[PDB]
């Protein structure tokens, strides 16, 4: 058995496509090159067979279909946002409260 090293366009690549799938959790997926974070949620919107990944008004991947399974999953980001702290003056007291 002998091979060729970078003498032609590549044809025989090894399988590097992760191991399993994750549901109901925001983890970093890699859908054949595109990388994104979100929660895979079932979608009631009908998907045409040729379509692979969706696009929102932000031009980001919000919908996708499985490369093998015919099922379709929506990308919804998990809990995120700014946090604000309310407090009185330091001379009066030091009690604080959290607010999202």
């Amino acid at each position: 058995l002998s091979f060729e090293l970078l003498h032609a366009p590549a044809t025989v690549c090894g399988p590097k496509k992760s191991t399993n799938l994750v549901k109901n959790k925001c983890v970093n997926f890699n859908f054949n090159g595109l990388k994104g974070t979100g929660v895979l949620t079932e979608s009631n919107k009908k998907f045409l067979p040729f379509q692979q990944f969706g696009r929102d008004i932000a031009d980001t991947t919000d919908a996708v279909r499985d490369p093998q399974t015919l099922e379709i999953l929506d990308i919804t980001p998990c809990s995120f946002g700014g946090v604000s702290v309310i407090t009185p003056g330091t001379n009066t007291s030091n009690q604080v409260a959290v607010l999202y």
Binding site: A58, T60, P77, G81, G82
Partner: peptide
Amino acid sequence: RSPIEDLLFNKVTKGLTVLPPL
């Protein structure tokens, strides 16, 4: 709300967020 204000209200229709007014 008086119907004038109701008509006026009816005639008006990723990090970024909208703060509700006080």
